[PDB]
Amino acid sequence: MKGMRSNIPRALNAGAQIACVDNTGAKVVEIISVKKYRGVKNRMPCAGIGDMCVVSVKKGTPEMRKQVLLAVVVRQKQEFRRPDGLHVSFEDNAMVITDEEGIPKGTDIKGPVAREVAERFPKIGTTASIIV
Amino acid sequence: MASIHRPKRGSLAFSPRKRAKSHIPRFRAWPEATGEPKLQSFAGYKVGMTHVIMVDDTKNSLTQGMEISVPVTVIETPAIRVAAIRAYAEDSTGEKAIAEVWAADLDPELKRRIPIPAAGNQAEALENIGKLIEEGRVSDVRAVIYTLPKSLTGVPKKVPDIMESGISARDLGTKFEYSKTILGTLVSVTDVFKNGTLVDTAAITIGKGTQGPVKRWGIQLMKGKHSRQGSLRQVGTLGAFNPSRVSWRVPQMGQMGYHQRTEFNKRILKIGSDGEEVTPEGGFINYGLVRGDYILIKGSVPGPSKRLIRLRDPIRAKKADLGEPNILYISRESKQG
Amino acid sequence: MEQRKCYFCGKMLEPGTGKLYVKKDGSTYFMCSSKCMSNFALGRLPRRTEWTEKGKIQLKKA
RNA sequence: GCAGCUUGCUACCUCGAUGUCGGUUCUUUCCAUCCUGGCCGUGCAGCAGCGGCCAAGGGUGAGGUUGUUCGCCUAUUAAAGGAGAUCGUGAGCUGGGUUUAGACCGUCGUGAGACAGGUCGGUUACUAUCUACUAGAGGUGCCCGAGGUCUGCGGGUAAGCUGCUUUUAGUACGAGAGGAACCAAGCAGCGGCGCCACUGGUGUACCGGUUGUCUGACAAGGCAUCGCCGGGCAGCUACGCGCUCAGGAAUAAGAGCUGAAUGCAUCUAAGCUCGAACUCUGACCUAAAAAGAGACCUCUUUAAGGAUUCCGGUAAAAGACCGGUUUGAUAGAAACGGGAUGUAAGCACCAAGGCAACGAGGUGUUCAGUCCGCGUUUACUAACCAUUCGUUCCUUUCACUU
RNA sequence: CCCUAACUGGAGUCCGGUGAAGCUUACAUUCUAGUGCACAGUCUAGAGACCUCUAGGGGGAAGUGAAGACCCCGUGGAGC
RNA sequence: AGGCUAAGGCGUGUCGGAGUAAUUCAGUUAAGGGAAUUCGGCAAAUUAGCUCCGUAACUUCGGGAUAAGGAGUGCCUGCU
Ligand SMILES: [Mg+2]
Ligand SMILES: [Mg+2]
Ligand SMILES: [Mg+2]
Ligand SMILES: [Zn+2]
């Protein structure tokens, strides 16, 4: 997609369970694969901030559970750097449930969200209240 | 067998990976001239790295205009003396040295490298090279330069490093007359490179000794149960049954580092004249403080501190004129904290 | 070039250095070095550490 | 008909053993091409297909079952091709299956026992002689003697390959829906090379807290994985960071121009112009041990200069390499700068209390104390004293010196 | 494991002392193809190759260990 | 038990110097992810003493049971 302004390490890889922080009803979602990521041999599919991911709901409502959805990771403990040289990090990982193009399924996002995903997916920026 | 495909480990583009045959990098090719006469190369010594907060000026970049922190590399680049003027005769076999003329006046420190040439055939060698250029035997003129590291306190040496730097002009008579003007003089790095222009940095990289295949080629460590069976940092197989020989393309241990490498499009960010503008508190680590005139190069450069760095104008520079940078802050805080 | 102050030691964040640590509730802390971030992560308080300027402030209160 | 990549047929080689499947690691090869590049046809409007030709430079992944090969299934993806290399690869690994000795189930057999049936368990030996490769040196060969700077016979490369988004453009096309390409820009995936300002790891230098115990108590220390725990400079390193283009020539399929054989027409029979991720040049690494064994300049012949002794680190497995040597800041000390930890011991007061003695601990002296495999100033000490080669070695086979 | 990194002690590397063993008809600096009992460093035709030493891990020597324990044969055995 | 010390026995679990690679035997630590590795959580990691609260299916009524899930713990002053 559109290039962000900050370098983001691909912290999360396939099999990680990330606290889904929207009101979609899915609580914990496991990363199955990552859109727009061709791998190399033996390398697990990694996903840093602003990446769309294919996830399966592990914990949540009875209707969201076991589905395969599209999610965007909005926070990560693995620190990234801003263009001015400062490194930014978060207390926990988190992803929101979205569509192919970037529109979230939920209506409010609890907690902060990195500003890079706000500038890439502007609907994710507007839906979330506090942006970091 | 359902083959799983992996790219080859390491590059065969840089083989045989042996120890480079000189501490001075050598340029195999030089860019064609596009303007007024000037030396195409300068030599400096790498001091260390810092970072600047420069306003972004790169056209079409995402972060244009806004503040960025660019890792720079301060390089201590005093004046150089254009020692000799050497002309080459081109033929079917190749370029061959046809004649040289050394400068009459030269630094006394040069004796540690080569015995000092006498101030003899200065006018007559020049007229001989002029006649050779006139008749047509001469094709290109190059200048011999050496550093004068006796001033630098961070570099322990005082012997010059001698190297050839081609002149950049249009006509071989024009090149000869410019070389006559600059022969035997001290030309600062401001007379070669301009502020904001790309260059090519070549230098013998950091020697890492006899390193193993996992570090030399980035091969895979043995995984899982194979990690503790007796071969962990060893290549899994050296060849098939046939052909009955180890290929040269198999990863193996050997000399890692201390190779010559060329880096393209290393931008110049600052042309300074006082070492206190960039020298941090406590000096640089294992170097000292800057005492001559320097240049700030964006990004990394091959080689450790104190290594000779050869600078030439770019040979494959994609981008146009870039303009003067706008440094807001050269970070001269301590590198030891 | 916004001027940033370290949450723990009180040192001013120099340009091109430091970290920005964010909690789950949107609170942001500027850490000048790994030492300040590690002391924050242990649960220590700047007021109860004498080398920080907050600890010096509290000790010079009395 | 081809291939010999499945199963057969055969019995030519091997039974004084060519370690037998599958996976893993790493390298290479073929094209009958899955994707990437170039074309042709269409029942090709566009988008997207379908079929064919050229093309092997690069890519061809991650997972669930199963020992599997194969095959299915999942979500990505440009695509997630196939095959060869003793069904590549056990003096590399694994040991899941098959193919030992034990045992159970079923079926055969009167029985011992058997099953191209299933199940559980079941030893991976070796100090590398030669060769090959990978790097590092010592010689001679070439050669006025030495040094320096270059050239380039050659060798190598993928040094890049490929997607996503924006613009072109909601335009061409189309009745509508739907919907491209040329140029340009940014970012990303993988690969390559390099680096340590920033971030992260380590950091058994160092600093602090503290358990148990020993040295009589305090102080200072020993041991218990660095006792454990917290922090971390330098260094190294990635999880961090820098760079990573073409252009040109000749071409394959193909598309044409001129043009006859065949008065015309014809891309072909001569000739000519374009035409690809291929080839070549261009970059980049290496390259006088190129037997055509190189070119030029400088210095000087008992010298030029090299090596060793000495102080070192930009280097280092040994060698080698790169510097300094009193006309010197090469390494060390002293001091200071810059940093690591967190406020030392002793003393004064306070301390929940205790009649008292005592008292964990708090505050002041004290941003203290301790420490720095970093820098600067500084010859204070140590880089001094030598030494050997550049003489065949004796000879008066002499260019001599008793 | 993605994906490896740094550090510690013992080896290894280098040095002083001591000090064996296993493979071995000979030669041997190889590489390609063919031929040959159809799996060649020694044949045939080409291509490369100056020699010596050190370190490296194991491509090849159908590497060494060993009169195959699988299959067959023996007017050979043993146990049941 | 394990750790630290007496007495007692020893520096002979009879090769030393040196601190310069790769690799190897045995250890320490490792961001973010947490079995995605693999035939298989093999190996390693986690937890761990004592007191108190509390403890399920099922059961041959004996058990399961230390089930599981939790809290406290040092030092000093003074006492019962
Ligand atoms: Mg083998
Ligand atoms: Mg036999
Ligand atoms: Mg018979
Ligand atoms: Zn701070």
Side-chain angles (χ1 to χ4, degrees), chain A residues 10 33 36 38 40-41 43 79:
Chain A
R10 313 186 90 100
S33 57
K36 309 178 190 301
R38 309 150 290 181
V40 70
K41 184 191 180 196
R43 177 162 312 179
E79 71 270 6

PDB file of all heavy atoms in Angstrom, chain A residues 10 33 36 38 40-41 43 79, chain D residues 25 61 75-77 189-190 199:
ATOM      1  N   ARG A  10       8.836  -5.924  11.701  1.00  0.00           N
ATOM      2  CA  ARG A  10       7.775  -6.925  11.631  1.00  0.00           C
ATOM      3  C   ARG A  10       7.910  -7.838  12.842  1.00  0.00           C
ATOM      4  O   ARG A  10       8.489  -8.924  12.789  1.00  0.00           O
ATOM      5  CB  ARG A  10       7.845  -7.692  10.319  1.00  0.00           C
ATOM      6  CG  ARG A  10       8.010  -6.803   9.101  1.00  0.00           C
ATOM      7  CD  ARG A  10       7.924  -7.597   7.814  1.00  0.00           C
ATOM      8  NE  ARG A  10       6.556  -7.678   7.322  1.00  0.00           N
ATOM      9  CZ  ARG A  10       6.062  -6.915   6.359  1.00  0.00           C
ATOM     10  NH1 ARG A  10       6.801  -6.003   5.753  1.00  0.00           N
ATOM     11  NH2 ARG A  10       4.795  -7.073   5.992  1.00  0.00           N
ATOM     12  N   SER A  33      -1.827 -15.466   8.336  1.00  0.00           N
ATOM     13  CA  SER A  33      -0.981 -15.040   7.234  1.00  0.00           C
ATOM     14  C   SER A  33      -1.043 -13.526   7.137  1.00  0.00           C
ATOM     15  O   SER A  33      -1.796 -12.868   7.855  1.00  0.00           O
ATOM     16  CB  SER A  33      -1.406 -15.691   5.919  1.00  0.00           C
ATOM     17  OG  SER A  33      -2.759 -15.398   5.632  1.00  0.00           O
ATOM     18  N   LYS A  36       0.170  -9.202   1.212  1.00  0.00           N
ATOM     19  CA  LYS A  36       1.268  -8.474   0.573  1.00  0.00           C
ATOM     20  C   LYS A  36       2.617  -8.825   1.194  1.00  0.00           C
ATOM     21  O   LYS A  36       3.494  -7.973   1.340  1.00  0.00           O
ATOM     22  CB  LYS A  36       1.032  -6.963   0.617  1.00  0.00           C
ATOM     23  CG  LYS A  36      -0.324  -6.525   0.102  1.00  0.00           C
ATOM     24  CD  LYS A  36      -0.491  -5.028   0.224  1.00  0.00           C
ATOM     25  CE  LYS A  36      -1.923  -4.596  -0.045  1.00  0.00           C
ATOM     26  NZ  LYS A  36      -2.398  -4.981  -1.396  1.00  0.00           N
ATOM     27  N   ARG A  38       5.205 -11.877   0.407  1.00  0.00           N
ATOM     28  CA  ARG A  38       5.832 -13.095  -0.082  1.00  0.00           C
ATOM     29  C   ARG A  38       7.009 -13.419   0.823  1.00  0.00           C
ATOM     30  O   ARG A  38       7.831 -12.549   1.119  1.00  0.00           O
ATOM     31  CB  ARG A  38       6.308 -12.930  -1.522  1.00  0.00           C
ATOM     32  CG  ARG A  38       5.279 -12.405  -2.478  1.00  0.00           C
ATOM     33  CD  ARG A  38       5.936 -11.619  -3.587  1.00  0.00           C
ATOM     34  NE  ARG A  38       6.478 -10.357  -3.105  1.00  0.00           N
ATOM     35  CZ  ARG A  38       7.092  -9.467  -3.868  1.00  0.00           C
ATOM     36  NH1 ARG A  38       7.278  -9.674  -5.158  1.00  0.00           N
ATOM     37  NH2 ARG A  38       7.527  -8.337  -3.323  1.00  0.00           N
ATOM     38  N   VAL A  40      10.281 -16.062   2.356  1.00  0.00           N
ATOM     39  CA  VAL A  40      11.447 -16.795   1.897  1.00  0.00           C
ATOM     40  C   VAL A  40      11.390 -18.136   2.622  1.00  0.00           C
ATOM     41  O   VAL A  40      10.505 -18.370   3.442  1.00  0.00           O
ATOM     42  CB  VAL A  40      12.757 -16.030   2.178  1.00  0.00           C
ATOM     43  CG1 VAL A  40      13.054 -15.996   3.657  1.00  0.00           C
ATOM     44  CG2 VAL A  40      13.929 -16.534   1.341  1.00  0.00           C
ATOM     45  N   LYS A  41      12.316 -19.034   2.288  1.00  0.00           N
ATOM     46  CA  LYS A  41      12.302 -20.377   2.852  1.00  0.00           C
ATOM     47  C   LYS A  41      12.552 -20.349   4.352  1.00  0.00           C
ATOM     48  O   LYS A  41      13.503 -19.725   4.826  1.00  0.00           O
ATOM     49  CB  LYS A  41      13.355 -21.241   2.170  1.00  0.00           C
ATOM     50  CG  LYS A  41      13.355 -22.689   2.613  1.00  0.00           C
ATOM     51  CD  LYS A  41      14.583 -23.397   2.108  1.00  0.00           C
ATOM     52  CE  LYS A  41      14.603 -24.837   2.542  1.00  0.00           C
ATOM     53  NZ  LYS A  41      15.956 -25.437   2.382  1.00  0.00           N
ATOM     54  N   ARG A  43      11.026 -18.858   6.681  1.00  0.00           N
ATOM     55  CA  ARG A  43      10.689 -17.632   7.387  1.00  0.00           C
ATOM     56  C   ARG A  43       9.196 -17.595   7.670  1.00  0.00           C
ATOM     57  O   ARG A  43       8.383 -17.713   6.750  1.00  0.00           O
ATOM     58  CB  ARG A  43      11.109 -16.424   6.561  1.00  0.00           C
ATOM     59  CG  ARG A  43      10.737 -15.096   7.164  1.00  0.00           C
ATOM     60  CD  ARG A  43      11.552 -13.993   6.540  1.00  0.00           C
ATOM     61  NE  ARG A  43      12.961 -14.355   6.503  1.00  0.00           N
ATOM     62  CZ  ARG A  43      13.914 -13.597   5.988  1.00  0.00           C
ATOM     63  NH1 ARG A  43      13.645 -12.420   5.454  1.00  0.00           N
ATOM     64  NH2 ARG A  43      15.170 -14.030   6.012  1.00  0.00           N
ATOM     65  N   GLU A  79       9.672  -1.789  19.426  1.00  0.00           N
ATOM     66  CA  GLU A  79       9.767  -0.364  19.155  1.00  0.00           C
ATOM     67  C   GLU A  79      10.177  -0.100  17.713  1.00  0.00           C
ATOM     68  O   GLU A  79      11.050  -0.770  17.158  1.00  0.00           O
ATOM     69  CB  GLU A  79      10.759   0.299  20.112  1.00  0.00           C
ATOM     70  CG  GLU A  79      12.211  -0.044  19.851  1.00  0.00           C
ATOM     71  CD  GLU A  79      12.681  -1.267  20.619  1.00  0.00           C
ATOM     72  OE1 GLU A  79      11.846  -1.928  21.269  1.00  0.00           O
ATOM     73  OE2 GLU A  79      13.886  -1.582  20.548  1.00  0.00           O
TER      74      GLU A  79
ATOM     75  P     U D  25      16.249 -27.026   5.256  1.00  0.00           P
ATOM     76  OP1   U D  25      15.931 -25.719   5.866  1.00  0.00           O
ATOM     77  OP2   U D  25      15.687 -27.356   3.928  1.00  0.00           O
ATOM     78  O5'   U D  25      17.831 -27.155   5.188  1.00  0.00           O
ATOM     79  C5'   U D  25      18.630 -26.746   6.284  1.00  0.00           C
ATOM     80  C4'   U D  25      20.089 -27.021   6.046  1.00  0.00           C
ATOM     81  O4'   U D  25      20.308 -28.443   5.921  1.00  0.00           O
ATOM     82  C3'   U D  25      20.680 -26.439   4.778  1.00  0.00           C
ATOM     83  O3'   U D  25      21.033 -25.077   4.941  1.00  0.00           O
ATOM     84  C2'   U D  25      21.874 -27.346   4.519  1.00  0.00           C
ATOM     85  O2'   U D  25      22.982 -26.964   5.317  1.00  0.00           O
ATOM     86  C1'   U D  25      21.360 -28.692   5.020  1.00  0.00           C
ATOM     87  N1    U D  25      20.863 -29.593   3.952  1.00  0.00           N
ATOM     88  C2    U D  25      21.766 -30.370   3.264  1.00  0.00           C
ATOM     89  O2    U D  25      22.963 -30.326   3.447  1.00  0.00           O
ATOM     90  N3    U D  25      21.226 -31.200   2.324  1.00  0.00           N
ATOM     91  C4    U D  25      19.899 -31.341   2.013  1.00  0.00           C
ATOM     92  O4    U D  25      19.557 -32.131   1.142  1.00  0.00           O
ATOM     93  C5    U D  25      19.021 -30.526   2.768  1.00  0.00           C
ATOM     94  C6    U D  25      19.524 -29.709   3.684  1.00  0.00           C
ATOM     95  P     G D  61       8.721 -23.224  -3.056  1.00  0.00           P
ATOM     96  OP1   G D  61      10.014 -23.728  -3.565  1.00  0.00           O
ATOM     97  OP2   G D  61       7.502 -24.049  -3.205  1.00  0.00           O
ATOM     98  O5'   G D  61       8.920 -22.918  -1.513  1.00  0.00           O
ATOM     99  C5'   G D  61       9.912 -22.000  -1.095  1.00  0.00           C
ATOM    100  C4'   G D  61       9.351 -20.944  -0.182  1.00  0.00           C
ATOM    101  O4'   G D  61       8.340 -20.167  -0.873  1.00  0.00           O
ATOM    102  C3'   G D  61       8.627 -21.439   1.051  1.00  0.00           C
ATOM    103  O3'   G D  61       9.486 -21.887   2.079  1.00  0.00           O
ATOM    104  C2'   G D  61       7.796 -20.229   1.425  1.00  0.00           C
ATOM    105  O2'   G D  61       8.602 -19.210   1.992  1.00  0.00           O
ATOM    106  C1'   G D  61       7.345 -19.764   0.046  1.00  0.00           C
ATOM    107  N9    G D  61       6.060 -20.371  -0.345  1.00  0.00           N
ATOM    108  C8    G D  61       5.815 -21.260  -1.355  1.00  0.00           C
ATOM    109  N7    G D  61       4.562 -21.605  -1.440  1.00  0.00           N
ATOM    110  C5    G D  61       3.947 -20.905  -0.421  1.00  0.00           C
ATOM    111  C6    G D  61       2.598 -20.849  -0.008  1.00  0.00           C
ATOM    112  O6    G D  61       1.627 -21.450  -0.475  1.00  0.00           O
ATOM    113  N1    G D  61       2.424 -19.991   1.072  1.00  0.00           N
ATOM    114  C2    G D  61       3.418 -19.270   1.676  1.00  0.00           C
ATOM    115  N2    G D  61       3.068 -18.499   2.708  1.00  0.00           N
ATOM    116  N3    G D  61       4.673 -19.314   1.298  1.00  0.00           N
ATOM    117  C4    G D  61       4.855 -20.134   0.251  1.00  0.00           C
ATOM    118  P     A D  75      -9.050 -21.100   2.997  1.00  0.00           P
ATOM    119  OP1   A D  75     -10.415 -20.676   3.378  1.00  0.00           O
ATOM    120  OP2   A D  75      -8.830 -21.668   1.648  1.00  0.00           O
ATOM    121  O5'   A D  75      -8.103 -19.838   3.150  1.00  0.00           O
ATOM    122  C5'   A D  75      -8.054 -19.121   4.369  1.00  0.00           C
ATOM    123  C4'   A D  75      -6.716 -18.465   4.564  1.00  0.00           C
ATOM    124  O4'   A D  75      -5.674 -19.468   4.639  1.00  0.00           O
ATOM    125  C3'   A D  75      -6.257 -17.552   3.446  1.00  0.00           C
ATOM    126  O3'   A D  75      -6.867 -16.277   3.496  1.00  0.00           O
ATOM    127  C2'   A D  75      -4.749 -17.522   3.647  1.00  0.00           C
ATOM    128  O2'   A D  75      -4.383 -16.611   4.671  1.00  0.00           O
ATOM    129  C1'   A D  75      -4.469 -18.941   4.128  1.00  0.00           C
ATOM    130  N9    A D  75      -3.969 -19.807   3.047  1.00  0.00           N
ATOM    131  C8    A D  75      -4.656 -20.614   2.181  1.00  0.00           C
ATOM    132  N7    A D  75      -3.901 -21.259   1.333  1.00  0.00           N
ATOM    133  C5    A D  75      -2.630 -20.833   1.660  1.00  0.00           C
ATOM    134  C6    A D  75      -1.356 -21.128   1.150  1.00  0.00           C
ATOM    135  N6    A D  75      -1.147 -21.969   0.138  1.00  0.00           N
ATOM    136  N1    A D  75      -0.284 -20.520   1.709  1.00  0.00           N
ATOM    137  C2    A D  75      -0.469 -19.658   2.718  1.00  0.00           C
ATOM    138  N3    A D  75      -1.616 -19.315   3.292  1.00  0.00           N
ATOM    139  C4    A D  75      -2.656 -19.937   2.708  1.00  0.00           C
ATOM    140  P     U D  76      -6.632 -15.226   2.309  1.00  0.00           P
ATOM    141  OP1   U D  76      -7.495 -14.050   2.569  1.00  0.00           O
ATOM    142  OP2   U D  76      -6.764 -15.952   1.024  1.00  0.00           O
ATOM    143  O5'   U D  76      -5.121 -14.772   2.513  1.00  0.00           O
ATOM    144  C5'   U D  76      -4.283 -14.460   1.416  1.00  0.00           C
ATOM    145  C4'   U D  76      -2.833 -14.453   1.817  1.00  0.00           C
ATOM    146  O4'   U D  76      -2.395 -15.811   2.089  1.00  0.00           O
ATOM    147  C3'   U D  76      -1.882 -13.959   0.746  1.00  0.00           C
ATOM    148  O3'   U D  76      -1.786 -12.549   0.709  1.00  0.00           O
ATOM    149  C2'   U D  76      -0.584 -14.664   1.101  1.00  0.00           C
ATOM    150  O2'   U D  76       0.057 -14.037   2.199  1.00  0.00           O
ATOM    151  C1'   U D  76      -1.104 -16.021   1.562  1.00  0.00           C
ATOM    152  N1    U D  76      -1.194 -17.036   0.476  1.00  0.00           N
ATOM    153  C2    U D  76      -0.029 -17.502  -0.095  1.00  0.00           C
ATOM    154  O2    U D  76       1.067 -17.076   0.217  1.00  0.00           O
ATOM    155  N3    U D  76      -0.179 -18.440  -1.074  1.00  0.00           N
ATOM    156  C4    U D  76      -1.350 -18.987  -1.526  1.00  0.00           C
ATOM    157  O4    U D  76      -1.318 -19.839  -2.410  1.00  0.00           O
ATOM    158  C5    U D  76      -2.515 -18.494  -0.885  1.00  0.00           C
ATOM    159  C6    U D  76      -2.398 -17.570   0.066  1.00  0.00           C
ATOM    160  P     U D  77      -1.831 -11.790  -0.697  1.00  0.00           P
ATOM    161  OP1   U D  77      -1.413 -10.384  -0.498  1.00  0.00           O
ATOM    162  OP2   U D  77      -3.127 -12.100  -1.338  1.00  0.00           O
ATOM    163  O5'   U D  77      -0.703 -12.519  -1.539  1.00  0.00           O
ATOM    164  C5'   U D  77       0.668 -12.372  -1.210  1.00  0.00           C
ATOM    165  C4'   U D  77       1.519 -13.254  -2.080  1.00  0.00           C
ATOM    166  O4'   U D  77       1.069 -14.626  -1.983  1.00  0.00           O
ATOM    167  C3'   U D  77       1.445 -12.959  -3.562  1.00  0.00           C
ATOM    168  O3'   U D  77       2.228 -11.843  -3.935  1.00  0.00           O
ATOM    169  C2'   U D  77       1.884 -14.277  -4.183  1.00  0.00           C
ATOM    170  O2'   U D  77       3.296 -14.414  -4.159  1.00  0.00           O
ATOM    171  C1'   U D  77       1.271 -15.285  -3.215  1.00  0.00           C
ATOM    172  N1    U D  77      -0.019 -15.836  -3.695  1.00  0.00           N
ATOM    173  C2    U D  77       0.011 -16.878  -4.597  1.00  0.00           C
ATOM    174  O2    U D  77       1.029 -17.360  -5.028  1.00  0.00           O
ATOM    175  N3    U D  77      -1.197 -17.354  -5.002  1.00  0.00           N
ATOM    176  C4    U D  77      -2.427 -16.910  -4.606  1.00  0.00           C
ATOM    177  O4    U D  77      -3.430 -17.449  -5.067  1.00  0.00           O
ATOM    178  C5    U D  77      -2.396 -15.835  -3.671  1.00  0.00           C
ATOM    179  C6    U D  77      -1.222 -15.352  -3.259  1.00  0.00           C
ATOM    180  P     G D 189       9.553  -5.161   3.954  1.00  0.00           P
ATOM    181  OP1   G D 189       9.348  -5.723   5.305  1.00  0.00           O
ATOM    182  OP2   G D 189      10.842  -4.511   3.630  1.00  0.00           O
ATOM    183  O5'   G D 189       9.314  -6.310   2.886  1.00  0.00           O
ATOM    184  C5'   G D 189       8.273  -7.261   3.046  1.00  0.00           C
ATOM    185  C4'   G D 189       8.440  -8.423   2.104  1.00  0.00           C
ATOM    186  O4'   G D 189       8.199  -7.991   0.743  1.00  0.00           O
ATOM    187  C3'   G D 189       9.826  -9.044   2.050  1.00  0.00           C
ATOM    188  O3'   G D 189      10.083  -9.933   3.119  1.00  0.00           O
ATOM    189  C2'   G D 189       9.834  -9.698   0.681  1.00  0.00           C
ATOM    190  O2'   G D 189       9.130 -10.929   0.689  1.00  0.00           O
ATOM    191  C1'   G D 189       9.055  -8.683  -0.140  1.00  0.00           C
ATOM    192  N9    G D 189       9.930  -7.696  -0.799  1.00  0.00           N
ATOM    193  C8    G D 189      10.173  -6.433  -0.353  1.00  0.00           C
ATOM    194  N7    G D 189      10.962  -5.742  -1.115  1.00  0.00           N
ATOM    195  C5    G D 189      11.275  -6.614  -2.136  1.00  0.00           C
ATOM    196  C6    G D 189      12.076  -6.420  -3.279  1.00  0.00           C
ATOM    197  O6    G D 189      12.719  -5.416  -3.588  1.00  0.00           O
ATOM    198  N1    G D 189      12.127  -7.557  -4.070  1.00  0.00           N
ATOM    199  C2    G D 189      11.465  -8.727  -3.815  1.00  0.00           C
ATOM    200  N2    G D 189      11.616  -9.722  -4.691  1.00  0.00           N
ATOM    201  N3    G D 189      10.695  -8.909  -2.759  1.00  0.00           N
ATOM    202  C4    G D 189      10.638  -7.820  -1.969  1.00  0.00           C
ATOM    203  P     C D 190      11.560 -10.053   3.734  1.00  0.00           P
ATOM    204  OP1   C D 190      11.480 -10.990   4.872  1.00  0.00           O
ATOM    205  OP2   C D 190      12.141  -8.708   3.947  1.00  0.00           O
ATOM    206  O5'   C D 190      12.387 -10.771   2.586  1.00  0.00           O
ATOM    207  C5'   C D 190      12.062 -12.091   2.194  1.00  0.00           C
ATOM    208  C4'   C D 190      12.756 -12.487   0.919  1.00  0.00           C
ATOM    209  O4'   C D 190      12.332 -11.629  -0.171  1.00  0.00           O
ATOM    210  C3'   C D 190      14.260 -12.345   0.900  1.00  0.00           C
ATOM    211  O3'   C D 190      14.951 -13.347   1.620  1.00  0.00           O
ATOM    212  C2'   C D 190      14.544 -12.325  -0.591  1.00  0.00           C
ATOM    213  O2'   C D 190      14.398 -13.616  -1.160  1.00  0.00           O
ATOM    214  C1'   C D 190      13.398 -11.457  -1.083  1.00  0.00           C
ATOM    215  N1    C D 190      13.795 -10.027  -1.128  1.00  0.00           N
ATOM    216  C2    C D 190      14.534  -9.562  -2.219  1.00  0.00           C
ATOM    217  O2    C D 190      14.818 -10.353  -3.127  1.00  0.00           O
ATOM    218  N3    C D 190      14.916  -8.270  -2.258  1.00  0.00           N
ATOM    219  C4    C D 190      14.597  -7.452  -1.261  1.00  0.00           C
ATOM    220  N4    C D 190      14.990  -6.185  -1.341  1.00  0.00           N
ATOM    221  C5    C D 190      13.857  -7.887  -0.140  1.00  0.00           C
ATOM    222  C6    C D 190      13.490  -9.165  -0.115  1.00  0.00           C
ATOM    223  P     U D 199      19.475   5.479  21.872  1.00  0.00           P
ATOM    224  OP1   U D 199      18.696   6.124  22.951  1.00  0.00           O
ATOM    225  OP2   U D 199      20.845   4.991  22.141  1.00  0.00           O
ATOM    226  O5'   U D 199      18.626   4.256  21.323  1.00  0.00           O
ATOM    227  C5'   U D 199      17.212   4.315  21.290  1.00  0.00           C
ATOM    228  C4'   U D 199      16.612   3.030  20.787  1.00  0.00           C
ATOM    229  O4'   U D 199      17.030   2.787  19.423  1.00  0.00           O
ATOM    230  C3'   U D 199      17.019   1.763  21.508  1.00  0.00           C
ATOM    231  O3'   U D 199      16.361   1.585  22.747  1.00  0.00           O
ATOM    232  C2'   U D 199      16.695   0.697  20.477  1.00  0.00           C
ATOM    233  O2'   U D 199      15.302   0.444  20.423  1.00  0.00           O
ATOM    234  C1'   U D 199      17.117   1.398  19.191  1.00  0.00           C
ATOM    235  N1    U D 199      18.505   1.059  18.818  1.00  0.00           N
ATOM    236  C2    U D 199      18.722  -0.119  18.146  1.00  0.00           C
ATOM    237  O2    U D 199      17.836  -0.895  17.853  1.00  0.00           O
ATOM    238  N3    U D 199      20.030  -0.378  17.852  1.00  0.00           N
ATOM    239  C4    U D 199      21.116   0.406  18.146  1.00  0.00           C
ATOM    240  O4    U D 199      22.239   0.059  17.801  1.00  0.00           O
ATOM    241  C5    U D 199      20.816   1.611  18.831  1.00  0.00           C
ATOM    242  C6    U D 199      19.552   1.880  19.140  1.00  0.00           C
TER     243        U D 199
END
